[PDB]
């Protein structure tokens, strides 16, 4: 039983590298985090900040979620992130991605007790 909080860590946390390691980063990370197992996940963002710093976003700027729920939070500081986007030639099971590094404010949805990130909504 993977919890929602653990799923967010698997799908979205990568504190180990300070930035998009290489042009192959998304190709390796989308696979190793199990985001290409059943299908090529089309887009996905990894955050290169400490877990504590990302969890703290749940007490930062409350903003509307893209789905219209109210439990989304925008980081006051910018964070190092890597966006992964599936290439046009990518065909499962050989999912292929472009790796793009950015420094943006993240928006996450938070739930539970403790109140922790469960969904990556956007970067701005």
At 31, which CATH number? 3.10.130.10
Measured CA to CA, the distance from residue 30 to residue 95 in angstroms comes to 8
Beginning with the edge strand found earlier in the chain, give each strand of the sheet holding 106-111 in spatial order.
61-63, 72-74, 106-111, 116-123
Do the Cβ atoms of 65 and 117 come closer than 8 Å? no
Q: Which of 27, 119, 120, 123 is catalytic?
A: 119
The annotation places the binding site for substrate at 7, 10, 41-45, 66, 85
Spell 32-63 as b/e; 16+ CB within 10 A means b. ebebbeeebbeebbbbbbeeeebbbbbebeeb
Q: Whole domain around residue 63: which residue ranges?
A: 1-124
Resolution of this entry, Å: 1.5
């Amino acid at each position: 039983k993977e919890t929602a909080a653990a799923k967010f860590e698997r799908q979205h946390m990568d504190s180990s590298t300070s930035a998009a390691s290489s042009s192959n980063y998304c190709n390796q990370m989308m696979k190793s985090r199990n985001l290409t197992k059943d299908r090529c996940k089309p887009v996905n963002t990894f955050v290169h900040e400490s877990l504590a710093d990302v969890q703290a976003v749940c007490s930062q700027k409350n903003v509307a979620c893209k789905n219209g729920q109210t439990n989304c939070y925008q980081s006051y500081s910018t964070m190092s992130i890597t966006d992964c986007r599936e290439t046009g030639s990518s065909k499962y099971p050989n999912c292929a991605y472009k790796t793009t590094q950015a420094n943006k404010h993240i928006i996450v949805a938070c739930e539970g007790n403790p109140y922790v990130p469960v969904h990556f909504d956007a970067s701005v």
